[PDB]
Design a protein around this ligand. Structure first.
Ligand SMILES: CNc1ccccc1C(=O)O[C@H]1[C@@H](O)[C@H](n2cnc3c(N)ncnc32)O[C@@H]1COP(=O)(O)OP(=O)(O)OP(=O)(O)O
Ligand SMILES: C=C[C@@]1(C)CC(=O)[C@]2(O)[C@@]3(C)[C@@H](O)CCC(C)(C)[C@@H]3[C@H](O)[C@H](OC(=O)CCCCN3CCN(C)CC3)[C@@]2(C)O1
Ligand SMILES: Nc1nc2c(ncn2[C@@H]2O[C@H](COP(=O)(O)OP(=O)(O)OP(O)(O)=S)[C@@H](O)[C@H]2O)c(=O)[nH]1
Ligand SMILES: [Cl-]
Ligand SMILES: [Mn+2]
Ligand SMILES: [Mn+2]
Ligand SMILES: [Mn+2]
Lengths: 189, 330, 188
């Protein structure tokens, strides 16, 4: 009654995936706004599909930034692999062999694991979102991927139960924020 | 049954001291805070000596000899991690023993200084020892700035309490609302005595009038329009001395005290001079004219004359404070 | 569908990335969202006013409000001045919230106009977002702005003056892809 309801709910052990069309704006100065909004939509259509299959949930979309968390809403201890295969699928999701999208695009997956705080802010035009430093981190993990090799924070490897094959991403050199907190970054193979 | 209390107040009103009273009354390591004590004593003196030349007119010593003891403390003021040598205790103490240093101290309001001054300096002897172990009062007088918010989980009569001390500074008020949500009642804190000193945050605003305007902010806050504040007119002892002594009238700082008469409902404690009686209540009604305006019966204000460094008084009050949480069914 | 004149406005709070603390006191970052909700929500209380009856709230990027006026139609460029009245709107509120949080937030803005290709997207829960370069800049004119000021482009600079608004040239700022462009600030 004092503070508006704030429909937010903590949620402690999930994996968060972030993707960005590497070099997109380059694609822009070449194609019609329409074919772009289309290529974009096209891509995201197949994304929400590859999304619900690996048991993950898509949060929101920002232009070319499509970020889908995992382990929600109902808790799934499987959060690790989820985002992992999400990126997996996401990589082949840019099969330009059938997507005549123009100048070479690629995702820049940036996964991470930690605790969250999801819900919706405001009272109008609600949009489901995720909030937490960990969530801030997974964003920079996205802002630190190479040619779309999947980034995975050391916390993401501790839930992978060492199943996948990762290599030192030397993150931090790639992105300031990773270095700032000295986070050991890897890369799935 | 769990209750959460937030303490608010101007700068150095005496919040943390209360939260310390709390541990003391409801909760060996006294050898790790000895340091901070000496660091107080340090500032205590170096601050007084410092402001002797700066003041206008100047405050010169009576024993010119001490010019060299002045150069000593002034040669250690910015020194990092002082090792505390007997020389310090010495020259400092002789400086305290000096009449012009006290003279500078009787006007310690024209310059920012801590409250534990009078106290610590009067026991350089007791502090200097190698076996000096801070007693209980010594640990409630040791001043330290609170940076952020800390939760003290204590229990009383099989009923839990959660104390929340917060940065009393201005640069700290940006963290209060981080606890404004679902908290029993607000213990406000004031320095009934600080009615003669400008704040540290700027050196131009009356501490008291800043405590009034602060109370105003919380009392009328859009998230505290339902939460009852239990104002704490603290440092009642200091207020008195300043009052009684008269070396600083109250009506020259708050002219609205000239037309002021003494209250009816007043319950004048046991031979508390009529000069004090009137004063302390005056300082009550300044906070009351605020709680009288808005509120609109959604929340009321329960004042409490107090002395945070009196584990005796503080208990009498945190009991009334334990009462109203049960009585008003808060 | 695609429009020919859609005034896009971003209103971010850099000052929040810091205020957001994840501590055991603030229920781990909650109690500050709880305050950010109290803002965004308090910021939405505008869309339901007479003056901003035509103001549309596109979305919300974390601690960044995204509105747009001019999506209810086929002067012709007046809602630009309306969008600004709304920039001035959020500020009135944003600063007022401070008065009760003892905080000090400042609003940073990036208004612009042109063709935006509004529509929905997604296979699950579709969302209504306005794509287009007009918006590309609208954001880049925010991400590089100044607090308490509104950063408008050349043309926007112009139009705003014919409405009674003075504009000062911040200088040049590289709006990536579109290259180095000249921006101005709306004299408050
Ligand atoms: C001329 N550009 C376009 C023509 C029609 C459809 C889209 C574009 C386009 O590239 O739009 C940009 C924003 O307007 C559009 N956008 C929409 N909503 C947005 C938003 N809320 N915040 C930021 N950008 C947003 O996304 C795009 C991302 O730019 P960003 O700077 O985020 O790119 P990047 O993510 O780092 O990609 P790259 O690696 O290639 O540099
Ligand atoms: C609400 C508090 C706080 C501090 C915590 C948080 O998790 C965020 O909500 C994220 C991180 C988080 O939700 C990931 C999505 C997104 C949208 C990216 C948010 C913004 O970056 C927020 O800040 C901002 O508004 C500033 C940065 C926005 C710039 N980013 C750069 C990367 N691209 C891909 C998207 C835009 C955020 C940081 O703010
Ligand atoms: N003489 C006297 N001193 C008191 C009294 N109550 C508190 N103090 C003194 O006030 C000084 C400042 O106390 P403190 O608790 O630090 O204030 P604060 O409100 O907590 O301010 P901060 O520390 O967050 S910035 C301490 O040295 C303490 O002993 C009192 O009733 N009388
Ligand atoms: Cl005060
Ligand atoms: Mn991209
Ligand atoms: Mn982007
Ligand atoms: Mn304190």
């Amino acid at each position: 009654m004092m503070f508006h309801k704030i429909y937010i709910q903590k949620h402690d052990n999930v994996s968060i995936l972030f993707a960005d069309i590497e070099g997109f704006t380059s694609l822009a100065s070449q194609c019609t706004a329409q074919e772009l909004v289309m290529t974009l939509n096209e891509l995201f259509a197949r994304f929400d599909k590859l999304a619900a299959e690996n048991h993950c949930l898509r949060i929101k979309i920002l232009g070319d930034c499509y970020y889908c968390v995992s382990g929600l809403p109902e808790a799934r201890a499987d959060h690790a692999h989820c985002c992992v295969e999400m990126g997996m699928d996401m990589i082949e999701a840019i099969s330009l062999v059938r997507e005549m999208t123009g100048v070479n695009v690629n995702m820049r997956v940036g996964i991470h694991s930690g605790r969250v705080h999801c819900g919706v802010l405001g009272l109008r035009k609600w949009q489901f979102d995720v909030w937490s430093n960990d969530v801030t981190l997974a964003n920079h993990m996205e802002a630190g991927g190479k040619a779309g090799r999947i980034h995975i924070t050391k916390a993401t490897l501790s839930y992978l139960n060492g199943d996948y094959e990762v290599e030192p991403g030397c993150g931090g050199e790639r992105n300031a924020y990773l270095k700032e907190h000295s986070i050991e970054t890897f890369l799935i193979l | 049954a769990t209750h959460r209390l937030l303490l608010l107040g101007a700068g150095e009103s005496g919040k943390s001291t209360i939260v310390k009273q709390m541990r003391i009354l409801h909760v060996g390591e006294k050898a790790t805070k000895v340091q901070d004590i000496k660091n107080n004593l340090k500032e205590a003196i170096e601050t007084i000596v410092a402001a002797m030349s700066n003041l206008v007119p100047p405050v010169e010593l009576a024993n010119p000899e001490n010019q060299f003891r002045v150069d000593y403390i002034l040669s250690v003021m910015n020194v990092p991690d002082f090792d505390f040598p007997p020389e310090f205790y010495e020259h400092a103490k002789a400086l305290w023993e000096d009449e012009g240093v006290r003279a500078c101290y009787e006007r310690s309001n024209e310059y920012q200084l801590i409250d534990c001054a009078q106290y610590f300096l009067d026991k350089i002897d007791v502090i200097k020892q190698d076996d000096y172990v801070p007693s209980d009062q010594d640990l409630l007088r040791c001043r330290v700035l609170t940076s952020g918010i800390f939760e003290t989980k204590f229990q009383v009569d099989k009923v839990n309490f959660h104390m929340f001390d917060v940065g009393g500074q201005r640069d700290e008020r940006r963290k209060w609302i981080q606890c404004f949500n679902d908290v029993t009642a607000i213990i406000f804190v004031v320095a009934s005595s600080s009615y003669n000193m400008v704040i540290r945050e700027d050196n131009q605003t009356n501490r008291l009038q800043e405590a009034l305007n602060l109370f105003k902010s919380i009392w009328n806050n859009r998230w505290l329009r339902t939460i009852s504040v239990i104002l704490f007119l603290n440092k009642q002892d200091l207020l008195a001395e300043k009052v009684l002594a008269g070396k600083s009238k109250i009506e020259d700082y708050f002219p609205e005290f000239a037309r002021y008469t003494t209250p009816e409902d007043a319950t004048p404690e046991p031979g508390e001079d009529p000069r004090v009686t009137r004063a302390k209540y005056f300082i009550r009604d300044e906070f009351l004219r605020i709680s009288t305006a808005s509120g609109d019966g959604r929340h009321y204000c329960y004042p409490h004359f107090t002395c945070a460094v009196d584990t005796e008084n503080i208990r009498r009050v945190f009991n009334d404070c334990r009462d109203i949480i049960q009585r008003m069914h808060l | 569908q695609s429009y020919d004149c859609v005034c896009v406005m971003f209103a971010s709070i850099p000052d929040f990335k810091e205020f957001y603390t994840e501590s055991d006191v603030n229920k781990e970052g909650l109690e500050c969202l709880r305050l950010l909700n109290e803002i965004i929500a308090d910021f939405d209380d505008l869309l339901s006013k007479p003056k901003f009856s035509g103001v549309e709230k596109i979305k919300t990027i974390g601690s960044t409000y995204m509105a747009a006026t001019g999506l209810s139609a086929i002067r012709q460029y007046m809602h630009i001045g309306t969008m600004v009245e709304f920039a001035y709107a959020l500020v009135g509120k944003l600063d007022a919230i401070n008065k009760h949080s003892f905080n000090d937030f400042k609003l940073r803005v990036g208004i612009n106009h042109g063709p935006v290709i509004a529509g929905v997207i997604g296979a699950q829960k579709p969302q209504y977002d306005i794509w287009g370069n007009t918006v590309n800049v609208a954001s880049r004119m925010d991400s590089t702005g100044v607090l308490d000021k509104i950063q408008v482009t050349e043309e926007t600079s112009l139009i705003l003056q014919t409405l009674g608004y003075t504009c000062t040239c911040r200088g040049i700022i590289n709006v990536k892809g579109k290259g180095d462009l000249k921006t101005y600030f709306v004299n408050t």
